[model samples]
Target chain A: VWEDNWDDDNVEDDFSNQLRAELEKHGYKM
Target chain B: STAQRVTYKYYVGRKAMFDSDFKQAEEYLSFAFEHCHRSSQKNKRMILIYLLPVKMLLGHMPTVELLKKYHLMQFAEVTRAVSEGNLLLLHEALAKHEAFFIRCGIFLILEKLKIITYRNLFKKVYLLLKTHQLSLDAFLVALKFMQVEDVDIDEVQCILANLIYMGHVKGYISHQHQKLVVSKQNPFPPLSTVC
Candidate 1:
């Protein structure tokens, strides 16, 4: 069965990517 | 320099802050809080002053130090607002505090929607990782959302217990007579949602 957890489909990674992209776009590295 | 000047500076401060002027925000907030410190009206203004550094605009990453400070100062505001029988202000504070937890769920949702990364997701996400598990965590926040949807805004006994369980505030509303209800004098505080 497929899990609906945060990391189930790399959701956490995608979250990290978006957070990174948003912050980087805002000139933030953290 | 004077009382009127203090008031003006405070207004200018909030305006500047909204305009993204952090330096002026710091300066005018100081003047306002310092001048109004002894006034009964100052209680609310003090809450405004405490929001500056809590915004964390002057930081690199959101450090725990600043976050903890925000919690401390914000709760101080909550206490002050509640103590003065300012139910509206109490509701406002609850709403603002609700954001912190809601954001946790929002981050999880964003993660699900491919908006956040593994490096900076909430710890709950990682705690499950080692055991080869993951979590939604949003269901933990369901009561708050159901509150706004399922309940009417009127002051009722059911709403009181709902506020107690969901908003976590304890107090039975007294002095609410039938005439007050007919006159539309709402005596209950609102419940803010996490979802």
Candidate 2:
């Protein structure tokens, strides 16, 4: 829902993992 | 600025989309969107950023009303998705804008019929006919066809009658109910027109 998007360079690896974690916080699961 | 950079940006977004890295896709899409928007570049980017996603998304388009309101009608895909979303949302007026462009050929006729059948009513005729909408005789024929079929009959039993009539009109209903009386007028009326 956040319009603030993560641009390419910073949104890799750990940031990607954190993004998954964020989705998890909102009840997303693998 | 050059074609190469544009292609690169498109690839970046496409690769991100393929990877399901929505965030990354958004990044590349940002560049693609911007790069595509440049004066001489608008047409090309529209083929991708606007068109493909709109179809894939359909009723779930991210910003349909905005794109339509802003007059981004040329990119075929954006208009398609927007039209789909508009009809779903009962924005009939907006949906017809693109429908009007199509040439009055067999394909266009059938497509419009499908729109009438699918949108708002299962079979009843419309007020969707406005200026340049459905052309001149298309409405009369469509309405007359609906009438003979008894599509909007007050009683549901007559729906069968309408179906047979429709089938006959379409040259698909092989048999007509020989003993049954046909409808004299339409139950649901067409949108009245003015000269």
What is the Cα-based lDDT of residue B119 in candidate 2? 24
Put down candidate 2 lDDT per residue, B1-195, tens digits, no spaces: 556676686677666555544455556655665566456544553434332332222112334444454454433442332223123323333245445323311122223323323221322122222111122222223323224343332332343345444332121211343222323343222211100
lDDT: worst 10-residue window of model 1 chain B: B110-119
Report the C-alpha lDDT of model 1 over B1-195, residue by residue, as the tens digit. 567777787677667655656566657766666666465453433434333332222211223343354344444443333222223344566567666525432212211211111111222222223222212222111112223344333423343344334432223333343111111222222211111
Query: What residue runs in model 2 are displaced by over 4 Å at the alpha carbon?
Result: A1-30, B41-66, B69-195
TM-score of 2: 0.27
Best by lDDT: 1
Please report the candidate that would top DockQ against the real structure: 1
> TM per model?
0.28, 0.27
> Scoring model 1 with DockQ, what do you get?
0.03
lDDT of 1 by residue, A6-30 (tens): 2222423433344334434543332
